[PDB]
Please model this.
Amino acid sequence: TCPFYKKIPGTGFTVDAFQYGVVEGCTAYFLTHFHSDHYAGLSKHFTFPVYCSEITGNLLKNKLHVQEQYIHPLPLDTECIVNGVKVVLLDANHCPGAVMILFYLPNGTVILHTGDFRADPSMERSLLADQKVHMLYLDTTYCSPEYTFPSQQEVIRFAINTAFEAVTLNPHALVVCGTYSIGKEKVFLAIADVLGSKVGMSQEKYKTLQCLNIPEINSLITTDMCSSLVHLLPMMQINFKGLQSHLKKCGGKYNQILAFRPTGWTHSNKFTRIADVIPQTKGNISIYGIPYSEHSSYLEMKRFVQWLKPQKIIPTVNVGTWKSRSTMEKYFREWKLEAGY
Ligand code: NI
Model:
């Protein structure tokens, strides 16, 4: 059955709750972003109102064939009324189209649901600054102090310099980037830009990218793999066997692959600096695991919550084990005592 942390009290609303059948007494289903653990259950047969961003609405219409009449896109940073309740969508700094949702309950309670987010100080200057939040439904994916990672900017710098050096030393090297969902587009777009290439990809992936309102996208992407030296492949194919195979398919146009796997976190972060990352190499194939995250680090998440000062926190991630739940609760208490709320 639908867990309590997907229900918004004092409303008929649920968040990211599409895999439970008909939720009893739900009058509107909100979708924070187009990732499969969150949309799981939607299709052309869904007949209840879905509230989301424009971008997420483009993906629902074109990738899952949800019918237009049940898609209710909302503009960002705008007070809107949904079944008699004021709501605002804010940018979550996650993947394209991902939002946080502010609910203003008729009784005066104010609820923020972060969906998935990467907290940023820029959030401290949105419509969040304007009123108090009583309950926070928090993306706790990396809510433990071992999770440190670099900025997105530092990671992209590393990738661009790496790719540019390699191809300039060997103009017959191919660059490959892995993907399994939307998000992380900067990785492959930034590399293609420095190399003067388009990114080549499957028709299905090109279709997905065309739903995202990215400026000048027709100029950065293509389905002609032959004309491209940056190729996008499914994440599963980013291994020595899948890459050797791919290289065969290029018909002696290339003699070396440099591949990138943008992971969330990996334990080399506790020790290693971004400056100090090295690939795994086999023959003429090298694979770089880079820590490009679209979720908050522990320190980013802590700063956000200590700024917001919510009266109650409801975690939405890592809730399935008692040891996880109890450890998170302990962090929340520390943060509250250190900050004085
Ligand atoms: Ni996500």
